[PDB]
Write a protein that binds this ligand. Sequence first.
Ligand SMILES: CC(=O)N[C@@H]1[C@@H](O[C@@H]2O[C@H](CO)[C@H](O)[C@H](O)[C@H]2O)[C@H](O)[C@@H](CO)O[C@H]1O
Length: 70
Amino acid sequence: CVHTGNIGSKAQTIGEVKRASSLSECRARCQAEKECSHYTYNVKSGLCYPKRGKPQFYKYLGDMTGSRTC
Ligand SMILES: CC(=O)N[C@@H]1[C@@H](O[C@@H]2O[C@H](CO)[C@H](O)[C@H](O)[C@H]2O)[C@H](O)[C@@H](CO)O[C@H]1O
């Protein structure tokens, strides 16, 4: 499972990109979204990214994409 890394997902977000208290907070949000197959928690700004579809991983120090679960 993917969690901690420097790989951001250049994929379409389900809704508005809101910030989260922590990574687990983003996971909880991704658990609320039934279409959220993976979330990218930008620890650099603290933004939660509940995305769907195919994820386009790119190199960025601060973007941590999690495989939803795990
Ligand atoms: C912060 C930034 O400039 N990010 C660029 C990406 O743009 C958005 O980045 C946020 C978090 O970094 C989310 O990933 C959002 O979905 C992105 O659209 C941009 O897509 C990528 C392209 O390689 O570069 C980042 O630097």
